[PDB]
Design a protein around this ligand. Sequence first.
Ligand SMILES: *c1c(OC)c(OC)cc2nc(NC(=O)c3csc(COc4ccc(F)cc4)n3)sc12
Length: 350
Amino acid sequence: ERPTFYRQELNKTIWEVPERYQNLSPVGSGAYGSVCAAFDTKTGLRVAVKKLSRPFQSIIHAKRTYRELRLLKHMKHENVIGLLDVFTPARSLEEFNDVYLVTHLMGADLNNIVKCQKLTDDHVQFLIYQILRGLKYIHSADIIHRDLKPSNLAVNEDCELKILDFGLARHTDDEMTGYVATRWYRAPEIMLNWMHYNQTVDIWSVGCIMAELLTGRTLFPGTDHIDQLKLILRLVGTPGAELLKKISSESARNYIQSLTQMPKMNFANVFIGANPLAVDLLEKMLVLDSDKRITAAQALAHAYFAQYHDPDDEPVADPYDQSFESRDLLIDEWKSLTYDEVISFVPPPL
Ligand SMILES: *c1c(OC)c(OC)cc2nc(NC(=O)c3csc(COc4ccc(F)cc4)n3)sc12
């Protein structure tokens, strides 16, 4: 069933892709590999084609390659990036070395947007509604994005939004230090390693994004981890003894308790002019104790979204088996798992 491939030197590496993809032009590179824009003549879509870099370099790398593929093959939702295609030029596992992933080319992310208009309240409603719709789906599969931020949200011209990327297992300590948007949207329990985290970290991020859509300004633009914590605690208040019990590290608790206690601030006085219902939702998202945060399913039924809420058009995901995340396998074994997922790919009927 193999299409014909053709070769092209492109960025700095030789790209070998099926002839259906035409007019490749590099758009970005990095550590993960390299991306090219192309025209998929078989579907009429503008697509991003990513050539993985060093996919089976190490056991960690090989497992991360498999995780990304499993994750992308699974996502089938209007507000989440899906996989249009995945291919390798190799004809057998023995000659398998390269993986190419094909997705929708997305132009504008939420960043490009908060920076060229004061979103109307109805714009903010619709954007956050879609994020939570995608998050309800993602979380129903027990997937945690872990890295929600404006740059991870694609928004076309009709204001339709897609969640992109997913935190695979990247984030170096250096990329998280200082005055960087890579840390401004992260829940404090993840930020400071307080406890075992769960899907409620993503709702914290949504609260930060929503606040920024409403004000046009970063909610918690800390200059470092500790500065950012003080900004957080000044808004939401210092922890009480109940949340302190749940912080696993004696040292984090010990530092926490060094701080002068502070009451939670009045959000109506912080978000001046905002829809009282937006303020209300923000108060339920931006709760220090993650156990007490609103969930995505609960937030969709919040009155702030009455315009868009449709309980019969907020689907959940098929089961997603992540047992592989606990397996220790050799490089060759992850690679073979990945090859099986490549050759079993079924294009979307879309
Ligand atoms: C929403 C939005 O996010 C809250 C942003 O930020 C990216 C911009 C934005 N612009 C909008 N304006 C229109 O959608 C518009 C202009 S004319 C029209 C009716 O007909 C058309 C014309 C061209 C098209 F491609 C589609 C429809 N709609 S909404 C919004």
